[PDB]
Structure formats: C-alpha cells, structure tokens
Amino acid sequence: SISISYSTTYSGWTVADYLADWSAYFGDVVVDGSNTGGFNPGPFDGSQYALKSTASDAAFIAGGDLHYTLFSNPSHTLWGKLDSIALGDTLTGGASSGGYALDSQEVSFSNLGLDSPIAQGRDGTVHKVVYGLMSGDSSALQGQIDALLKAVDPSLSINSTFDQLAAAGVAHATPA
Amino acid sequence: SISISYSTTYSGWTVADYLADWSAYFGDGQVVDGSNTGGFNPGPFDGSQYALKSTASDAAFIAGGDLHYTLFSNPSHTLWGKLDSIALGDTLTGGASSGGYALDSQEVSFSNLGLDSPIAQGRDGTVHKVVYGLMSGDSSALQGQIDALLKAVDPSLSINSTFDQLAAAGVAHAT
Ligand code: HEM
Ligand code: HEM
Numbered sequence: 001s002i003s004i005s006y007s008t009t010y011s012g013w014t015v016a017d018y019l020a021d022w023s024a025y026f027g028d029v030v031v032d033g034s035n036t037g038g039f040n041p042g043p044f045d046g047s048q049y050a051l052k053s054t055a056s057d058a059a060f061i062a063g064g065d066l067h068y069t070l071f072s073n074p075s076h077t078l079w080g081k082l083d084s085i086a087l088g089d090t091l092t093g094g095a096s097s098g099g100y101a102l103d104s105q106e107v108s109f110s111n112l113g114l115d116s117p118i119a120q121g122r123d124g125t126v127h128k129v130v131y132g133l134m135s136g137d138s139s140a141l142q143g144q145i146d147a148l149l150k151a152v153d154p155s156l157s158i159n160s161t162f163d164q165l166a167a168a169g170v171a172h173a174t175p176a
Numbered sequence: 177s178i179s180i181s182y183s184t185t186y187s188g189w190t191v192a193d194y195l196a197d198w199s200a201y202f203g204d205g206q207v208v209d210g211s212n213t214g215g216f217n218p219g220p221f222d223g224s225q226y227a228l229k230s231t232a233s234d235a236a237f238i239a240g241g242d243l244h245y246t247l248f249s250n251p252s253h254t255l256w257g258k259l260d261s262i263a264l265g266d267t268l269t270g271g272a273s274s275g276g277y278a279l280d281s282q283e284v285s286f287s288n289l290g291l292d293s294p295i296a297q298g299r300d301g302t303v304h305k306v307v308y309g310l311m312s313g314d315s316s317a318l319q320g321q322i323d324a325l326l327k328a329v330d331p332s333l334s335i336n337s338t339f340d341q342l343a344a345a346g347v348a349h350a351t
Contacts, residue, residue, distance in 0.1 A: 032272050033223070033271055041211070042213065043213050094210060095210025096210065096211040096229070
C-alpha cells in the first residue's frame with residue numbers, strides 16, 4: 001500500500017496543508033521549452049516525468065511507466081502507470097544522466113498504484129493528477145492520496161499529520 | 177557574406193581539419209531519445225536555436241536562425257526555415273529557461289550562412305541536411321556550404337584556409 005517520505009520540517013503539517021502550500025509555491029505554468037517539462041528516457045514516454053517551476057526552485061517528479069500522446073488522438077493525454085510523486089526543490093539529472101532527481105526532496109508518495117488507459121483521454125486520473133501539479137492544483141493528487149490512506153485505515157486522511165501517519169506505518173521521516 | 181569567429185587555439189587549423197576533428201570528437205538503430213533529440217529554444221519544436229550534446233563526449237553545437245521542425249506532420253521529421261549560424265565547441269549550457277543556449281567553450285562560429293529552405297523541400301533541403309548530418313557528428317554537408325561561401329567571397333579562400341588566413345582576408349575574427 002501507499003508509502004510516504006517526509007522531511008522533518010513537515011512533521012506536524014497535514015498532507016492537505018503541505019500539498020496546498022507546495023502548489024502555491026510551484027505556481028501555474030503558451031507552452032515552450034521552459035514549460036513542457038521532460039520525460040526519462042523520452043521524448044514523449046518514460047519511467048519518469050519531471051517539471052521545474054518557471055516561478056520558483058520548486059520541482060516535481062512523477063514516476064512509473066508513462067505515456068504522453070502529444071498531438072495524437074486523444075491529444076495531450078498523459079496515461080500509463082503512476083507509482084510515485086516526488087515533490088521538492090531544485091531538479092537535477094535527466095535522460096542522459098540516468099534519471100531525474102531532486103536536490104532537496106521534501107515529500108514523496110510511493111506505491112500510488114494508479115493506472116489509466118489511453119481511452120479515457122484527459123479525464124483519466126494519472127492525467128488529472130500530473131496535469132494538476134503542472135498547473136498549481138494539487139487537489140487531484142490530494143483526493144487520490146485521501147482514498148489510499150482511508151483504505152489502509154478509516155482513521156487516516158489527507159488531514160492527518162505526517163507524524164500521525166508515521167505512527168500508522170505509512171510515513172517515514174528523513175532529514176532537512 | 178559569411179563571417180567566422182574562432183578561438184586563437186585553432187588559429188593554425190584549416191576549416192576542414194577542425195571540422196574533421198570536432199566530428200571525430202562528437203562521434204558516430206540507435207533509438208531516438210532525450211539523449212539525442214537535442215532541443216529548440218524557445219521550443220519545443222520551433223525556435224531561434226537548435227542545440228545538441230554528444231552522448232559520447234562533451235562536444236556540442238548550436239544552429240541559429242529561425243527554425244521549424246515537422247516531427248510527425250508533413251513532410252515527416254523535417255527541419256526547415258532559416259539557418260544563419262552554426263557554432264561548434266564544448267559544454268552546452270542554457271535552454272529556453274535561461275533565455276538561450278550557449279557553449280562554455282565556443283571554438284568556431286560560422287555566421288551569415290544565408291541558408292533558407294521551405295517546408296516543401298522536406299528532408300532534401302539544405303538546412304535539413306546540414307543539421308541532420310551534424311546530429312550524427314557528420315560535418316560534410318556543413319563543410320560543403322562553408323566552402324562555397326568562402327569561395328564566393330574570393331576563389332583563393334576555401335575550407336583549406338587556416339583561420340588565421342581567413343582573418344587576414346576579412347572574413348574571420350578571433351575570439
Ligand atoms: C513532456 C513533454 C511534453 C511536451 C513536449 C508537451 C507539449 C505541449 C505543447 C507544445 C502544448 C501546446 C498545445 C497547443 O498550444 O496547441 C501542450 C499542451 C498541453 N499539454 Fe503538454 N507537453 C508535455 C507534457 C505534458 C504532460 C505530462 C501533460 C499532462 C500530464 C500534458 C498535458 C497537456 C495539456 C492538457 C495541454 C493543453 C492542450 C490544449 O491547449 O488544449 N503535457 N503540451
Ligand atoms: C526536438 C528535437 C527532436 C525530436 C523531439 C525528434 C523526435 C524524433 C523521433 C521520436 C523520431 C523517431 C521516429 C520513430 O522512430 O518513432 C525522429 C526521427 C527523425 N528525426 Fe527527429 N526529432 C528532433 C529533431 C530533429 C532534427 C532537428 C532533425 C533534422 C535536422 C530531425 C530529423 C529526423 C529524421 C530525419 C528522423 C527519421 C529517422 C529514421 O526514421 O530513421 N529530427 N525524431
């Protein structure tokens with residue numbers, strides 16, 4: 001089931017609270033090179049999709065087995081399997097580096113278990129999750145995390161603190 | 177007409193020998209990837225620059241002008257538009273985000289190439305050949321145009337002239 005890493009800095013924050021603040025920090029991103037983001041290995045598919053903010057040093061990384069349709073029907077659909085979302089700050093590496101990595105990784109969500117097929121187009125969950133983050137709207141990631149936590153134990157939710165989810169077996173603290 | 181910039185390092189080199197050496201250095205089925213697409217500035221598929229790093233070494237180049245790339249549209253996988261410059265060297269930095277590509281060490285820059293190729297010509301256009309050739313480290317299409325451009329200025333000048341010699345002529349300038 002879902003597993004979570006967090007920086008001690010965020011020990012007392014609720015996930016809903018952390019994800020709202022992370023997204024306002026990242027902001028909203030005409031599409032061009034500064035703005036498309038990147039796939040590993042790419043160009044339009046890979047095990048990792050990563051995007052830097054145009055506004056701040058915030059950065060994120062979506063991992064699993066992902067496919068972007070670009071202009072093919074249904075256009076501008078991200079689909080595939082999404083296993084991880086890693087949020088933080090200052091993106092590094094890429095296709096010729098062997099993977100994207102965050103220099104300062106604040107929080108990660110792993111074993112999401114999300115899978116959307118091409119046929120749902122842009123209404124697919126994987127699409128609505130990653131596109132949300134690109135756009136400064138983590139609400140779709142929030143909604144999805146909330147369901148994973150609830151199925152583990154009906155007491156846990158995006159309004160649990162990270163530390164409470166550590167007590168629950170789900171989260172695991174790291175330095176800062 | 178054509179103008180060259182070169183690092184005093186290559187003052188003694190012929191244009192042909194330097195392009196032979198850069199190509200050897202850049203290097204030579206291979207699945208198309210983030211590691212060999214290069215990129216456009218602003219991009220993603222159009223800009224005032226295209227640039228690529230070799231996967232084998234630090235070698236890299238920047239094609240400058242007003243460039244368009246068809247990708248999957250027709251004619252498929254065609255670079256067209258205007259190509260004014262090719263810069264060759266080491267250590268590609270920058271991007272759309274940094275407001276431009278650059279080379280931390282630019283060795284040679286060929287400018288005022290006056291190359292202009294329409295969409296219709298597809299992959300048979302001179303812009304496409306020059307640049308695709310360079311995407312695999314092959315400077316022969318580039319070399320061919322630079323030679324014809326050197327000569328139009330004066331027949332005594334050519335790809336076999338040293339950069340020093342193209343300076344003395346008035347075509348080249350030391351960086
Ligand atoms: C990573 C490589 C990507 C590239 C090169 C790319 C490129 C583009 C470009 C060039 C456009 C402009 C469309 C237009 O103005 O006609 C666009 C729009 C769009 N992209 Fe991407 N994108 C990438 C990744 C993603 C991802 C991962 C998602 C979703 C998670 C996405 C979703 C969209 C959506 C929804 C649009 C809106 C199209 C519209 O205006 O209706 N893109 N993309
Ligand atoms: C943003 C940069 C580029 C991207 C993302 C890109 C993407 C691709 C991809 C994915 C393919 C493979 C088609 C396939 O096998 O499924 C391809 C092929 C090709 N590209 Fe590019 N390309 C780029 C730049 C260029 C440039 C600048 C040129 C010309 C100077 C070019 C010329 C070609 C040619 C001739 C092929 C066909 C090779 C073959 O089918 O064997 N590409 N491109």
